[PDB]
Ligand binder design. Sequence first.
Ligand SMILES: *CCC(=O)NCCCNc1nc2c(ncn2[C@@H]2O[C@H](COP(=O)(O)OP(=O)(O)O)[C@@H](O)[C@H]2O)c(=O)[nH]1
Ligand SMILES: [Mg+2]
Length: 163
Amino acid sequence: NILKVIILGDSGVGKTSLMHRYVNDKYSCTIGADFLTKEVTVDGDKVATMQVWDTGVAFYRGADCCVLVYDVTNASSFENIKSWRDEFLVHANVNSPETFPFVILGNKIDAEESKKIVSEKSAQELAKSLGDIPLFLTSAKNAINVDTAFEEIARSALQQNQA
Ligand SMILES: *CCC(=O)NCCCNc1nc2c(ncn2[C@@H]2O[C@H](COP(=O)(O)OP(=O)(O)O)[C@@H](O)[C@H]2O)c(=O)[nH]1
Ligand SMILES: [Mg+2]
């Protein structure tokens, strides 16, 4: 029924921006709401409501998917991806750590090339080493790939929700 999605990653990577792009299709250069909600549409039907939880017992409870976000211009954000994945599994008490879904987002892909520091290859290798986690490279700013990425986040959440 309701899909709970958590977004983790270092501060400054674009977690809040990606949520706003997904939820409201906007971006500019929310206090008091623990989550924002967006109706998921698949094949032109409304199938479910997604809660997107941006950055605790009630915090982890009920999570259906976990999204991990680095910034392709910040090397340290990328090196911390496995830490965030691990921090989640160690605290969230999920029914089946073996099968719980993560999705990795490499954000700010709109940046000039000279400012990119993390290569696509390195990210594909890490996503693989972590259990073949889906990898998307994204731009909240320019609306690049966030639709396709959340399409897979929603699909992962739906599968976990109904398991
Ligand atoms: C409009 C002026 C500007 O910020 N220019 C730089 C564009 C670089 N490209 C870019 N920047 C992004 C993207 N998403 C988010 N941002 C920027 O990152 C910081 C922090 O974002 P936030 O969403 O607050 O991160 P956390 O919640 O993870 O802390 C902000 O400057 C935001 O504008 C993106 O796709 N591309
Ligand atoms: Mg934020």
